[PDB]
Structures are given as structure tokens and as C-alpha cells.
A = this chain, B = another copy of it.
Amino acid sequence: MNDIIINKIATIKRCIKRIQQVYGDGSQFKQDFTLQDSVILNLQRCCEACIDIANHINRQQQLGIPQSSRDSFTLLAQNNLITQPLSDNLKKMVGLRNIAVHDYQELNLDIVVHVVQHHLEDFEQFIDVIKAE
């Protein structure tokens, strides 16, 4: 219990599994748009899933009404559910919904390489904190 969080937690794991597979060792990714388009898309599916889980937890425990997507992570940290360094990294991702719906290609390709290398483990961390229960 409940189904929508266990399905949103499951999707985050599915998208991480996909980003890890499509990106590969990182060689082909830099010069293949099909590899980039998939990783970018599966990256966006994680952000909206965490924002859904955050807005859900704030709702069920009446932690407040999140005015933004970033403010939803703030209420979790202000009630000490997540550490404040973990909220900042998840809020760093909230602004990652803009690499898509914008084909400004090379300007931020090195950035998606950064978040794939260094920031996928912030989603694994967030869902681990939810797992308790």
C-alpha cells in the first residue's frame, strides 16, 4: 500500500534500468541522437515520478500544499523526511525537464552526461527513503 507509489517507485527503477542500458559505456552516446533522445526521455520520466511521490507524501501526511515542484521536496526536508543535501540534488533535477522540449543540442549534452554519471544515484536514494514503511 498504496498502488500509485509502488507503481511510481517501480517506474523510477525501470527508467534507471533503461538509462543505464541505452547510455552504455558512454562512447556511442555522445554522437548518437537516438541514444541521447532515449536517455533524455527516460531522465524526464524519473523527475515527474519523484515529484508525484513527493506531492503524494505531502498530501497523505498533510505536510502542506506544495506551490511548486521544488517546494514539494522542501516540505519533505523541512519535516526531516529527507536530508537537505538530498532535496537540493532532487531539486537540481526539477530543472532538468528543460533539456527536452528544446533541441538546443550540444550546449547541455555534457550536462546530461554529468547527471547520468553522478546523479542517477539520487533517485535510488530517494526511493530507498520512501521504502519505509
* Residues in A lying within 8 Å of B, measured CB to CB: 8, 11, 18, 22, 31, 33-35, 37-38, 40-42, 44-45, 48-49, 52, 74, 78, 80, 84, 101-103, 105-106
How many Å from the CB of A40 to the closest CB on chain B? 6
Partner of A34, one of B8, B38, B52, B105: B38
Dominant secondary structure of chain A at its interface with chain B:
helix
Evaluate contact between B37 and A41: CB separation under 8 angstroms: yes
- Please tell me which one of the listed residues B33, B40, B103 contacts residue A18 in the complex, with CB atoms under 8 A apart: B33
With contact pairs A31-B80, A80-B31, A84-B31 given, residues A102 and B48 touching in the complex (Cβ less than 8 Å)? yes
Cross-chain contact A101 with B38 (CB below 8 angstroms):
no
Q: Which residues of B contact A11 (CB under 8 A)?
A: 103
A102-B45 Cα distance, complex, nearest whole Å: 6
| Leading 10 A-B pairs by shortest Cβ distance | A37-B38, A48-B102, A34-B38, A41-B41, A37-B41, A22-B34, A38-B38, A34-B35, A37-B37, A40-B41
Nearest chain B residue, comparing its CB with the CB of A35: B34
